[PDB]
Each structure stands twice: as C-alpha cells, then as structure tokens.
Design a protein around this ligand. Sequence first.
Ligand SMILES: [Cl-]
Ligand SMILES: [Cl-]
Ligand SMILES: [Cl-]
Ligand SMILES: [Cl-]
Lengths: 173, 173, 173, 173
Amino acid sequence: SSQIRQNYSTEVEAAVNRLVNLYLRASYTYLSLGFYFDRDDVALEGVCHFFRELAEEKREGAERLLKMQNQRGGRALFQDLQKPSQDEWGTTLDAMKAAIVLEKSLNQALLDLHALGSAQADPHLCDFLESHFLDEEVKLIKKMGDHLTNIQRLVGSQAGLGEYLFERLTLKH
Amino acid sequence: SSQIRQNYSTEVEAAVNRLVNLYLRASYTYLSLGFYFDRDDVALEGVCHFFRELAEEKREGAERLLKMQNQRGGRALFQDLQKPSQDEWGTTLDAMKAAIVLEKSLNQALLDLHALGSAQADPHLCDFLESHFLDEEVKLIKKMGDHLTNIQRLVGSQAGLGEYLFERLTLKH
Amino acid sequence: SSQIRQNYSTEVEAAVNRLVNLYLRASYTYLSLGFYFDRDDVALEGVCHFFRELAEEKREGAERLLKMQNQRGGRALFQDLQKPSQDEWGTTLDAMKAAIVLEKSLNQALLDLHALGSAQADPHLCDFLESHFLDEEVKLIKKMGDHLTNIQRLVGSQAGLGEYLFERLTLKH
Amino acid sequence: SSQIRQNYSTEVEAAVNRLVNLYLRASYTYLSLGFYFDRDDVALEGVCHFFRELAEEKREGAERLLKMQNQRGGRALFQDLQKPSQDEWGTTLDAMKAAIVLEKSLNQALLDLHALGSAQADPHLCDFLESHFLDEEVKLIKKMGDHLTNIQRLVGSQAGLGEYLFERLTLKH
Ligand SMILES: [Cl-]
Ligand SMILES: [Cl-]
Ligand SMILES: [Cl-]
Ligand SMILES: [Cl-]
C-alpha cells in the first residue's frame, strides 16, 4: 500500500496518470510527424529532426511524471494510447500549426493540474510543475510561434522554394 | 497578433511593462549615484563601483522582464524614463539609505505583481518572479542593511575617517 | 567644487550632458527595436541581435562621456529620457532606415560638439571625440548603408523571402 | 643643417625646447618630493613611491619631446635646470597640493603649445600633443584631485592617523 503517501490527493493522483497519457500521446504524434518528413516524397530532414526531438522530450516528460507519482506514493496506471490524429501531415506549415495546437492542449492540462494542486494545497505538486514543465512549455510554444511566422513569410509566391529554404536555413540538419 | 499567448492577462501584461519602467528607472538612479561617487570632490571608488554594478543589475532585470513578455506573447511598451530623484547624493550613508528606499519600492512592486499573478491564476508569472527576482531582491536588501549598519557605526566622532574606512575596507575597489 | 577643472567651458560641460542624454535615448531606441524583432509575430533573430548590440554600444558611449565629464571636473546632470519614437518598427527595411536617421542625428551632435570644442580652444575635448566617437560613427553608418542596400535589392517581387534571406545570410544569429 | 625639416616653425621649435625644460624641472621636483617622504622622520613609503614614479614619468615626457624635436628636424637646446621650489614639503596634503599646482602649470604649457601649433598650421605637433600628453595630463590631475579629496576627509580630528591611513590604504607600498 503506502507507508509514504502524505498530502497527495486521489484527484491529483488521477490527474497525473491522465497527464502521463497525454504526454505519451504527444510523443506518439511527434513520432508520426518525424517519420512523415523522412518519406522520400517529402524529404525535409530538418523538419523530421525537429519532430523526432520533440517525441523524445514528450516521452521524457511522461517519465518524469511517473517518477514523481512513485515519489509521492501514488500508483501509476496506464491506459490505451490513441494513435495520432493524422496519417499524413501536409506541409511544414500544416505540421507546425498542428504542433502548436498540441502544445497549447498540453499547456492547458499543465495549468489545470497546477490549479488542482493549488486547490488541494499540494505545494510539492505545484512546485514540480513550475520547476520542470511550465517554463519548458512556454519556451517551446515561443519557438514554434517564431517558426510559424518565418514559415508564413516564406510562402509568398513560391511555396516549394520557401519550404526548402526554411528547412535548410532555420532547422538543424 | 498572437498565435502563442495563453493564460496571459492584459492586467499582467500592463503590470510587466510598468515594472520594466521601474527597473530602468532604478538603473538610471544607480548610474547617477555611481558617477557622483566618481567626482574628484567625492572620490569614493568602492562606492562608485557598488552603484555602477547595481545599475547593470537593474538593466538586466528589465531585459529579463522584456524577454518574458515576448515569451508569453505580450507586447513590450516603453514609456518615458524619469530622471533620478537627486543630482547630488550626499554622503555614502545618504546614498545607501536612498538605495534601500529604492529597493523596497522595487520589492513591493515585485510582490504586488506576484499577487496579481496569483489572483489571475498565472503560475508561470508567479514562478518567474520567484525564480529570478524575489530572492535576488531579499539578498540585496540584506546586503544594503548590513552596509548601512557598518556605515552608521563608523560615523562616531569622525565622519570623514569613517567614510574613508568603510569604502577602503568593506567595498571592493 | 573643482580643484581640477582647467580649460573646460560651461558650454562644453552642458553640451556633454546633452549628448549623454542623446546617447541614452539612442540606447533606449535600440532596446525597443531589439525586442520588437524578438516578437513571435516578427521573429527575426539576427535583426533583434543587431539592434540589441547597438543598444549596448550607445549606453557605453554615454558612459564614456560621463567618465570624461568627471575627468575634466564638470558635473554630470541627468534629464528625463524620452521613449523611442515608435512602439512598432515595421519591416527590417523600415527599421534600418530609422536607425540611419538616428545615427546621422548622433553624428551631427558629435560634429557640433567638436566644433564647439574647437571654438573654445579645448583640444582635449576635440581629441576625445576624434579618438572614441567620430570614426566609430562613420564605420557604423557605412555598415548600415551597406545593409540598407542589400535589404533593398532583396525586396524584388517577394518581400517576405528577401527579408528572411537577409536575416539568415547577412545578420549574425 | 636640415634636409628633413618641413612645416616646423622656429616658434614651435623654441617652445618645444622650453617645454622640455619644464618637464625636466618637474622631474627634479618629483625627485625631491620622493626623497623627502623617504626621510626617517617622515617615513611615508607610499607617498615616496607615488612621487618617484612621477619623476620618471616627467623625464620620459621630456625624452619624448626631444625625440620629436629631432624627428621634425629642429635642434634640441638645453638650459639650466632650476632646483625645486622647496627643500622640505610639509605634509602629504601640502605635497599633493603642490603637485596639482605643478601639473596645472604643465597642462597650461601643453595647451599653449597646442594653440601655437594650431596657429602655425602644424597638425603633426597638434596630433603629437593630443596622442601622448593632453589626456595623460588630464588623467593624472583627476587622480591627484581624487587623492586630495581623500587626504582632506582624513584630516578630521587626528591628522597623524589620517596621514598614516591614506598612505597605507590608498597608496601602493
Ligand atoms: Cl483497456
Ligand atoms: Cl510620450
Ligand atoms: Cl524633471
Ligand atoms: Cl648657462
């Protein structure tokens, strides 16, 4: 059972498990995005690398949540992981827009869990999200927004040219 | 506009811009204090160095606020910067007293913004102030209070002697 | 008072204080330009870096003037710092044009102060501007003019593309 | 005779020789000041070191003038060197006051020679004074003024104590 659990509500425990699912879902989404941009008929290596990096980051966030769950004496519970929302992700612009939507959904789940922790007077939970999640998410969304802006300015008259140039001169390859 | 902004109130945005003004004001105050102690008819190099260091620190705090403003998708807005409150700053004691007053005003602005962020349920803002501002300010005010105490004990019967000795043996030169 | 002042007119003293204000103003302008290009909906990092570097350079020029003021036995006097002329700076081209205008105004203030120093037979002042300001300003204006030319040749038919390419391939990022 | 002399007036040549005399005079003054503070009944080593350093600097300035005289094709002419104005130099304060008076006299001779060079349209002479003399002199006078201020604040009620402390904690020993 638990010899250690203290000030750790069932509501937070359950919300943490749900959040783990959301992060692993997001990881799966990024895995799919990365392999889509690796297709020979898409072939945007920097875009592939960007999303594959994110798949790892999201899996790592899930692992951190699970470690914390055990540190507090809650019980990790896993649920089915739904497949990503698309099988093909369109253009780099389409993909970066979908990524921002995803990140905003993760961010809102972080904020909701912070609020629950505040309401439950669980400062460890609140601190944990503050120290390892909230700023990481703000920085990532800023990066994506910066990317989106640059992608959009490159569409101009020649979408292919702009998409190639963004991948070559902004993304790491 | 903003593709990224999330959970970032107009009230916090505005308060952040005001705080930037207060930090740049404080930087300007320290610049003036530093050059006053550099005057040939004042000539207290360690006191000059102390305040010039602070001018840099305050400018850096303003820059951090502005970076954060952009990370959250708010709009930096600059206003006129008023000149420091004095053209001549008296003795080291006078100056350190004015510095403490200034720091307490900055500290109270930090606390007020934290409270606003708490009321707006903006944990990123709250965390940001906690991680980069609140303790830095507490440590600085403790240092100033320590300095003030030492300056006051040196006034004794011979103010000039005490003012020279404090600058030589406490402040870095 | 001053035990050191020699051959240092009140007119030069006053003009030096005014020039300090103009440099700190210019620094503030560059600060605003830098954070504008950091906006997620602008997102031109090399342009942000270019102007943030300039903000530092202009603050440094003000500090050098103030140091000199004290070396000659004049009295630094600070005035209010007006806010930059715009809250949003348009395109890179708009910004570089505004920067050149600013630099030409600083250059003319340098030249006017040199002429005053010559008329007052103050060779130290004249030398000081020659050694630390005049050539620095000529080199900067040449750089800006070079930049302007390249930005203008890239507008062509596709302004977004050209603006991205200039930032990627000319400016440091 | 001179195969090289060009644009080098007899008036400047003569003024350069006079200036050499003034620098060697100043060197002699500093030599005397240094050995006075080395007396067993004065015994202020940092004050001795300060003035002995200056004796060397002034001799070096004379040597630079003489080198320049030959570079321009003028004729070095030496005159008698008068002895310093005092045989005993009083207190550190007395000495630093006498040093400032001396430096202001050297500075005025520099300025007068610059003005002569300007009137004779001799830009090499003007440049030479600007590059090697005028700022060196301004910096030295600022240093002396800073010293004077600190010495004066230490007189207070206990002149001996203050004189010892200045020598120990400001001057290099
Ligand atoms: Cl199941
Ligand atoms: Cl205004
Ligand atoms: Cl005012
Ligand atoms: Cl003779």
